[PDB]
Amino acid sequence: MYKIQIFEKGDFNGQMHETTEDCPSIMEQFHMREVHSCKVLEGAWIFYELPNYRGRQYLLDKKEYRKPVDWGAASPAVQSFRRIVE
Template identity: 55%
Template sequence: MLHLAPSWHLQRGCKSLHAPTSSILQITFYEDRGFQGHCYECSSDCPNLQPYFSRCNSIRVDSGCWMLYERPNYQGHQYFLRRGDYPDYQQWMGFNDSIRSCRLIPQHTGTFRMRIYERDDFRGQMSEITDDCPSLQDRFHLTEVHSLNVLEGSWVLYEMPSYRGRQYLLRPGEYRRYLDWGAMNAKVGSLRRVMDFY
């Protein structure tokens, strides 16, 4: 994946981090609730937002789907945001006002497909998913997933049913154990495709 160095310029009173080729996809971070205080616009992946703001209490997503991270270098709690206004951190299910890195999720227009397994290293019962699943328990009688293979599209895995709890971004690739997607345990409640229209 190509990472473009951000460039700074002032726009509408906000400092901006814009990648020259992707300025139409944008997220704006505000230090205070209700879109108040200093704001920073970003249009590309940023592994370390710490130099640009100390806290984040509201966010406006003008376009695209984004995964936000509590710590630098895409670590810590993850938060999936799509186009919309988030006037306080509870609106994106945040635990606090700490956002230290962000990743733009590439738009996918084809089909979505993922295989989930009940054991590590793609062993045990396998189930294939091609659409959103609000409850793995109801559909597959599973509450844990120990490995998975994302074949097409990006997904968000939620720890609890109905798209609640901790969130994890799953991009195409193999995840041989739950640690590979950043989880502390194998608990999975729901899965959702990353699409820019909900």
């Protein structure tokens, strides 16, 4: 499993990026400073505020997230993410 789409803007607008693997730094990889919305097409993920899986964490397991408040965040600051492997 594991498939996720991240967007530059809220409600699924803007530049989109689809990935199936962990990302230690969204800026290095996708060249985005913030994540305004996303869709977890398959799997469960952990969103992190800072690169290298650090800072504040958010759980992304639902199908769609239109705005950052939907994953429990007060801002669109997300700089790394990874699949929850059990």
